[PDB]
Amino acid sequence: IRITLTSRNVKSLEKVCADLIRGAKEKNLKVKGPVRMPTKTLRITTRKTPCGEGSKTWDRFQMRIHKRLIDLHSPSEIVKQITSISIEPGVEVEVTI
Amino acid sequence: QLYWSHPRKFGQGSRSCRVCSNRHGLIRKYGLNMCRQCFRQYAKDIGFIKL
Amino acid sequence: KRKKKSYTTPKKNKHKRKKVKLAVLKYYKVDENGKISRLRRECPSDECGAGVFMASHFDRHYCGKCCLTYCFN
Amino acid sequence: MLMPKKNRIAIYELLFKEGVMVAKKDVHMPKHPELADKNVPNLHVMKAMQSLKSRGYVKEQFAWRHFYWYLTNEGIQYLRDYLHLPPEIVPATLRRSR
Amino acid sequence: AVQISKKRKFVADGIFKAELNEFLTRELAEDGYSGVEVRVTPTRTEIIILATRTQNVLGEKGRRIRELTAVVQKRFGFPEGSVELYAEKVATRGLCAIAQAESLRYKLLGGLAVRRACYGVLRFIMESGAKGCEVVVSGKLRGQRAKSMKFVDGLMIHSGDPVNY
RNA sequence: UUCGUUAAAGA
RNA sequence: UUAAAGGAAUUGACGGAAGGGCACCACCAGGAGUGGAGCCUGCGGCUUAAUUUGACUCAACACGGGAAACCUCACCCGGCCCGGACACGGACAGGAUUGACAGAUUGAUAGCUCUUUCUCGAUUCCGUGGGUGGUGGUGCAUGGCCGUUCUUAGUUGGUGGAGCGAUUUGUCUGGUUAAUUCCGAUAACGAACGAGACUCUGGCAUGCUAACUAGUUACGCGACCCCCGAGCGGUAACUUCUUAGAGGGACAAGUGGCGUUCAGCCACCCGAGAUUGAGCAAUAACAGGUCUGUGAUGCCCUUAGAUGUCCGGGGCUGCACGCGCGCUACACUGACUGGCUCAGCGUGUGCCUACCCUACGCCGGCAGGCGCGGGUAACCCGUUGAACCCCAUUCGUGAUGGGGAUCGGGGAUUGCAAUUAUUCCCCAUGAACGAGGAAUUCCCAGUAAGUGCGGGUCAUAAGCUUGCGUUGAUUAAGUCCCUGCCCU
Numbered sequence A: 001i002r003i004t005l006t007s008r009n010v011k012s013l014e015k016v017c018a019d020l021i022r023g024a025k026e027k028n029l030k031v032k033g034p035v036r037m038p039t040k041t042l043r044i045t046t047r048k049t050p051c052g053e054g055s056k057t058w059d060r061f062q063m064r065i066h067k068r069l070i071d072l073h074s075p076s077e078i079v080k081q082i083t084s085i086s087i088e089p090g091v092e093v094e095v096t097i
Numbered sequence B: 001q002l003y004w005s006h007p008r009k010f011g012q013g014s015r016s017c018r019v020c021s022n023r024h025g026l027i028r029k030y031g032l033n034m035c036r037q038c039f040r041q042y043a044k045d046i047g048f049i050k051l
Numbered sequence C: 001k002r003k004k005k006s007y008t009t010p011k012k013n014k015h016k017r018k019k020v021k022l023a024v025l026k027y028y029k030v031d032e033n034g035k036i037s038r039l040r041r042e043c044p045s046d047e048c049g050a051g052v053f054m055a056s057h058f059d060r061h062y063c064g065k066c067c068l069t070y071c072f073n
Numbered sequence D: 001m002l003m004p005k006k007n008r009i010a011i012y013e014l015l016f017k018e019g020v021m022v023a024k025k026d027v028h029m030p031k032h033p034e035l036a037d038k039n040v041p042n043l044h045v046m047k048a049m050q051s052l053k054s055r056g057y058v059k060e061q062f063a064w065r066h067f068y069w070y071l072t073n074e075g076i077q078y079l080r081d082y083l084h085l086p087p088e089i090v091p092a093t094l095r096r097s098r
Numbered sequence E: 001a002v003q004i005s006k007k008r009k010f011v012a013d014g015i016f017k018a019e020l021n022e023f024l025t026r027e028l029a030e031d032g033y034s035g036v037e038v039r040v041t042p043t044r045t046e047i048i049i050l051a052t053r054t055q056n057v058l059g060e061k062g063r064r065i066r067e068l069t070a071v072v073q074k075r076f077g078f079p080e081g082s083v084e085l086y087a088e089k090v091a092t093r094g095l096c097a098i099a100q101a102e103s104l105r106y107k108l109l110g111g112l113a114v115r116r117a118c119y120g121v122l123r124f125i126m127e128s129g130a131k132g133c134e135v136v137v138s139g140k141l142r143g144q145r146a147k148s149m150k151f152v153d154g155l156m157i158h159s160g161d162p163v164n165y
Numbered sequence F: 001u002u003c004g005u006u007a008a009a010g011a
Numbered sequence G: 001u002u003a004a005a006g007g008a009a010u011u012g013a014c015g016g017a018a019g020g021g022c023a024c025c026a027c028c029a030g031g032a033g034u035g036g037a038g039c040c041u042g043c044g045g046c047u048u049a050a051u052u053u054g055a056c057u058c059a060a061c062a063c064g065g066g067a068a069a070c071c072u073c074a075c076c077c078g079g080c081c082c083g084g085a086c087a088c089g090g091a092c093a094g095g096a097u098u099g100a101c102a103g104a105u106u107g108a109u110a111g112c113u114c115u116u117u118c119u120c121g122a123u124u125c126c127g128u129g130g131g132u133g134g135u136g137g138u139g140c141a142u143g144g145c146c147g148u149u150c151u152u153a154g155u156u157g158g159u160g161g162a163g164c165g166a167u168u169u170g171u172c173u174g175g176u177u178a179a180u181u182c183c184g185a186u187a188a189c190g191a192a193c194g195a196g197a198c199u200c201u202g203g204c205a206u207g208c209u210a211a212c213u214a215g216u217u218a219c220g221c222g223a224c225c226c227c228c229g230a231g232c233g234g235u236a237a238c239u240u241c242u243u244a245g246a247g248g249g250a251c252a253a254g255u256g257g258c259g260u261u262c263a264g265c266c267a268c269c270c271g272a273g274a275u276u277g278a279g280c281a282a283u284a285a286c287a288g289g290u291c292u293g294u295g296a297u298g299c300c301c302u303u304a305g306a307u308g309u310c311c312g313g314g315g316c317u318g319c320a321c322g323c324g325c326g327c328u329a330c331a332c333u334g335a336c337u338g339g340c341u342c343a344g345c346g347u348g349u350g351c352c353u354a355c356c357c358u359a360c361g362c363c364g365g366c367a368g369g370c371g372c373g374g375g376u377a378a379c380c381c382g383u384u385g386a387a388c389c390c391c392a393u394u395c396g397u398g399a400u401g402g403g404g405a406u407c408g409g410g411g412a413u414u415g416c417a418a419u420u421a422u423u424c425c426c427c428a429u430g431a432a433c434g435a436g437g438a439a440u441u442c443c444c445a446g447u448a449a450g451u452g453c454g455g456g457u458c459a460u461a462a463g464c465u466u467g468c469g470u471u472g473a474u475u476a477a478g479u480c481c482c483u484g485c486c487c488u
């Protein structure tokens, strides 16, 4: 049983990771590590201008999609107990049994 | 009536933009439909930063 | 540019379609003051031939709603 | 050019059930997608809603392809003329708020 | 049942954010519009509109917010009342530069000439705790050529990273 | 080494 | 006849005035080239019914991400429809407004029109006002955005000196620096924007944090040569390799010299680094470009035989010519054949309206087909088994086997349709080109160049562009002579 935290901002990612580990230390569950996935980056290069005057000057837009995985083997009742957490909207939660 | 021949399943004429249907300028295959004229204005709103 | 499109008139000013018929239409014929006689041919049973009569032609018959066309020698 | 008799009363029934109509720019020339709520795709919807936006009944807004039609208090006051046909029923916009 | 990639779902969500935000600044230009906050929740999709004048959002008897709820739910794919809207009154009117430009639009429409409107918004922003503003109004003003009128008071940082926040 | 003209107004 | 003419003086602006600085978009010492030949792609002139158009020094000329078979398309040719909203009003058909089979005409089975006559039913048809649309015109009316000045370093206020005042000093003789960056001299003192500082990335490291969607040591399953406890790959702990969070780490600090107490340069060491590359980037201008980006818009034209939108062709490609960015070669440091061996960004599915990425087996020589499987992704392509490079053979100074342009035949694939444009493969024809005149472009270290891959349009799809990797130079680290710019 694993839980994937897919995040847009790394600061809120680390905050919700610290909150989850702080809420998971006190229970009798073997908490595995928040595995650092490699950061996804969607680079887009843009002409900067509707009409072609001047030098070939290009916008270079990026994103930094971050991803963490934890492994918490438990029955589904304990999973639904852990599931109810108020979260910042920059982080998405998925579960996989 | 025959208003719609040319079934338009491919090519430049099929790609219609989400913003202003600027099918002359190209529309990128990024899970996205912009112009490059309006993606500049709306990239910081949809989540793209320059850095 | 300054391109001037002028009416060279290859074709004349043509007329559009105008729907014109007689004054009233008497489909049914009264015989012996109460018996109804039918002159025109009905439409076959394809959810069209309830009250729809077909068009007269030299060798064809044509329906109005669902455009069924029948031919006979 | 004659819309079927079910068409106008059905789109007015949808507008009376909701109060918000939604369409896109795609009137049949690149492609023919039908409307997600009704039978006629876009053209009869625009022809039915232009008479409502031109009589000062329903406001108009646009979101990048899509026409969103906006119900007015005076819009309901002139939809009373449509409410001649059913009994007096308030839609789910003005009656109550959860 | 259906699913898409993480590399495309986030940019689809961002296009949804920009679509909703810019359509609400189109149609809610009457009241003071600041911005939106959307919480991703699979039970009830909560959309929070931060507005300066919340009276037009609340409507007369809770009508306009339910109408905009129907606007969202009858295209964006959320049946049975999945999307729920909530307004937030913004107390600091002089903090939101979007609200300042939005009020400056309606002041420049109905008379209220450019010099007096620019000094009024500079005095209001300087009164509302700000360190420094810069109101620039450009266009055809009492003539043919476009006169570029700039007005600036206080302190302003133009270059570097922290200009954005 | 040479290169002419552009009014009336418009802050 | 006129309401000014004029005088010093202040600040801009402008000079075909001077002085001092800065710049590899200037030069020196060089490298790679272009201009020479062929081809690719834009531009001009022709031609054309049309070869749609904007842009013309840097600051236009593979730029409009502009690679067009139809779409894109705005240009010619011919032909449908009104989406003509809405108000008053004509007939209102004793309820007849819109749709079409058969034949002629038209590419058409457009009912476009005609002969023929069935159907839908108060939404109609027509007129008068009004509205819509346009990739129509006007970027010298405009918004926004970009480019350029200018990535050069330059601008401003408070208090106080000078002047009656506009104003001026501060903001400067000199030194240094990428910098108005500081030190200094000082009627100026503390200050502000800009430059730095800021953010991202690269380089170093901890047994700091931790991983079956990433690996390692042993061990077991288990193959193989000697057979001698060895070696090479296939299938219980720790993050060193892979990934990413925080913190550390570099500041010209240490020494000696050059310099005024200075500001700061030069050589060495410890160090991974004696500092890498980008983003943002002021006050203010151009009467720079874009109305062909829009439901951003002012004014003018049209709205029924349309400058609206479709349909079917042609066109932007069209050629006595000139110009620009590029690609291929002019070979032996090389071409061909065979073997060997190494990557890094990043992309990929039932999409908020049409769609992939590709393993395995068989067939075909190849371009390709068939069946089956995985992947919505550190999982599957994939331990991206790339090219260049390295080893062996052939070629032997011959426009040769280098060059592959032009040209004929055939075979595959997308697409509804490929011929006066697709694309790929096989055979064959085998040109100029012998290192390029005048002039000219870029460049200071993982840098130029050689070389391949990934994204953008994509279906077919790169010789363009954006990024990533492999090998990896020469010679400067200085200057105001040429050019351009700034300041006084």
Ligand SMILES: [Mg+2]
Binding pocket: A051, A052, A053, G063, G064
């Ligand atoms: Mg251009």
Ligand SMILES: [Mg+2]
Binding pocket: B010, B011, B012, B014, B015
């Ligand atoms: Mg396409």
Ligand SMILES: [Mg+2]
Binding pocket: B024, B025, B026
């Ligand atoms: Mg384009």
Ligand SMILES: [Mg+2]
Binding pocket: E138, E139, E146, E148
């Ligand atoms: Mg302006």
Ligand SMILES: [Mg+2]
Binding pocket: E137, E138, E139, E140, E141
């Ligand atoms: Mg203005």
Ligand SMILES: [Mg+2]
Binding pocket: E138, E139, E140, E146, E147, G142
């Ligand atoms: Mg203006």
Ligand SMILES: [Mg+2]
Binding pocket: E140, E144, E145, E146, G141, G142
């Ligand atoms: Mg003007």
Ligand SMILES: [Mg+2]
Binding pocket: none
């Ligand atoms: Mg003059």
Ligand SMILES: [Mg+2]
Binding pocket: none
């Ligand atoms: Mg004088």
Ligand SMILES: [Mg+2]
Binding pocket: G041, G325
């Ligand atoms: Mg060329």
Ligand SMILES: [Mg+2]
Binding pocket: G043, G061
């Ligand atoms: Mg040209």
Ligand SMILES: [Mg+2]
Binding pocket: G045, G046
């Ligand atoms: Mg020509």
Ligand SMILES: [Mg+2]
Binding pocket: G074, G135, G292
């Ligand atoms: Mg046009």
Ligand SMILES: [Mg+2]
Binding pocket: G141, G298
């Ligand atoms: Mg104008």
Ligand SMILES: [Mg+2]
Binding pocket: none
């Ligand atoms: Mg005085």
Ligand SMILES: [Mg+2]
Binding pocket: none
């Ligand atoms: Mg001064």
